Amino acid sequence: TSKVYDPEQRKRMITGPQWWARCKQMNVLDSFINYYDSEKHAENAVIFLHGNATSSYLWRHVVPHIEPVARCIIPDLIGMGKSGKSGNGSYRLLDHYKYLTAWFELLNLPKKIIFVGHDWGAALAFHYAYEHQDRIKAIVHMESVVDVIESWDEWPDIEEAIALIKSEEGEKMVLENNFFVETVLPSKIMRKLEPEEFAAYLEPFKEKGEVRRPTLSWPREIPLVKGGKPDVVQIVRNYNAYLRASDDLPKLFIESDPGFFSNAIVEGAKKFPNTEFVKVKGLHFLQEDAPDEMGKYIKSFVERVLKNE
Numbered sequence: 001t002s003k004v005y006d007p008e009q010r011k012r013m014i015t016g017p018q019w020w021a022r023c024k025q026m027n028v029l030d031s032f033i034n035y036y037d038s039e040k041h042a043e044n045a046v047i048f049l050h051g052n053a054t055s056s057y058l059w060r061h062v063v064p065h066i067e068p069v070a071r072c073i074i075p076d077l078i079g080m081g082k083s084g085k086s087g088n089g090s091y092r093l094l095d096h097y098k099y100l101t102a103w104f105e106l107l108n109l110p111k112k113i114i115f116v117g118h119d120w121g122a123a124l125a126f127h128y129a130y131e132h133q134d135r136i137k138a139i140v141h142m143e144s145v146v147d148v149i150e151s152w153d154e155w156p157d158i159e160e161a162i163a164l165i166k167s168e169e170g171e172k173m174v175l176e177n178n179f180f181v182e183t184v185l186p187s188k189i190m191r192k193l194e195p196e197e198f199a200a201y202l203e204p205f206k207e208k209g210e211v212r213r214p215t216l217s218w219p220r221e222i223p224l225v226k227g228g229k230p231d232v233v234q235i236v237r238n239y240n241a242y243l244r245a246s247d248d249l250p251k252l253f254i255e256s257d258p259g260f261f262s263n264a265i266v267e268g269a270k271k272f273p274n275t276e277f278v279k280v281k282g283l284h285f286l287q288e289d290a291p292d293e294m295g296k297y298i299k300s301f302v303e304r305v306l307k308n309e
């Protein structure tokens with residue numbers, strides 16, 4: 001089987017260098033963060049957080065829909081995109097969180113922030129919200145780390161896939177063979193990326209070896225109650241209980257159609273009160289298949305949240 005280019009895409013395409021040239025850099029702790037900032041309408045701030053394999057580039061066709069209503073800020077997570085590397089060489093959830101919260105202190109943010117999170121980016125937003133419950137205006141999430149995975153909800157294939165990723169063979173398939181960028185990322189986009197679009201995702205990870213570490217460390221954080229990192233399992237338990245009780249926090253969940261092993265994500269999202277549910281085309285990296293539908297849904301949700309405030 002083969003996937004097909006979107007025959008109109010080369011005409012609104014944004015290449016890697018075009019996106020990076022629009023970004024800014026800021027020293028943060030012992031490193032630096034590369035980020036997009038639309039600047040205008042700073043009375044609000046919408047912070048878009050990518051997850052594994054990607055970067056701020058993931059949001060390039062989503063963010064123009066929301067810029068007219070609020071300042072939009074989109075970082076490359078540490079070790080990813082064009083950001084600096086992690087000073088301690090480590091790329092666990094809490095390492096990412098250290099740089100993200102330090103970076104927030106430098107951004108002149110409003111008291112209450114809107115988060116838009118994908119995959120592990122949503123975990124970062126959820127954990128920030130749990131620790132800063134008075135700083136959250138709304139949360140948009142999609143393909144998100146909503147809850148732990150109990151052992152009776154863990155089937156053998158996911159058990160063995162995580163065993164593989166936690167083994168030396170898993171380390172080599174990522175660091176030497178770039179599994180998550182070269183295979184997982186295009187496999188979970190329904191269209192075929194233009195060569196220049198794929199090159200933007202490849203570029204941070206084009207060389208072999210340790211530079212690819214964040215794309216191995218993220219799946220190793222998976223919150224399997226059986227065998228998963230205990231600190232991450234507790235972080236996710238804590239913010240899941242907070243989200244289940246957060247009746248006054250407006251949320252938007254963007255469901256993928258058909259998604260990819262996403263049923264537990266959708267079911268977990270349904271346990272959070274005050275959630276608007278929408279659906280767009282996609283597998284996992286749904287920004288690449290339905291960015292304008294997503295941007296329109298988020299724009300309408302943000303306008304409704306601001307109007308009702």
Ligand SMILES: O=C(Cc1ccc(O)cc1)Nc1ncc(-c2ccc(O)cc2)nc1Cc1ccccc1
Nearest residue numbers: 144145146147148149157158161222223261264265
């Ligand atoms: O590792 C993750 C991240 C995650 C997302 C949501 C969540 O609640 C917990 C963790 N996801 C993942 N990671 C791996 C696989 C996977 C791997 C192998 C396989 O054969 C099938 C699925 N699937 C998934 C998606 C998934 C599965 C089960 C419960 C929730 C989310």
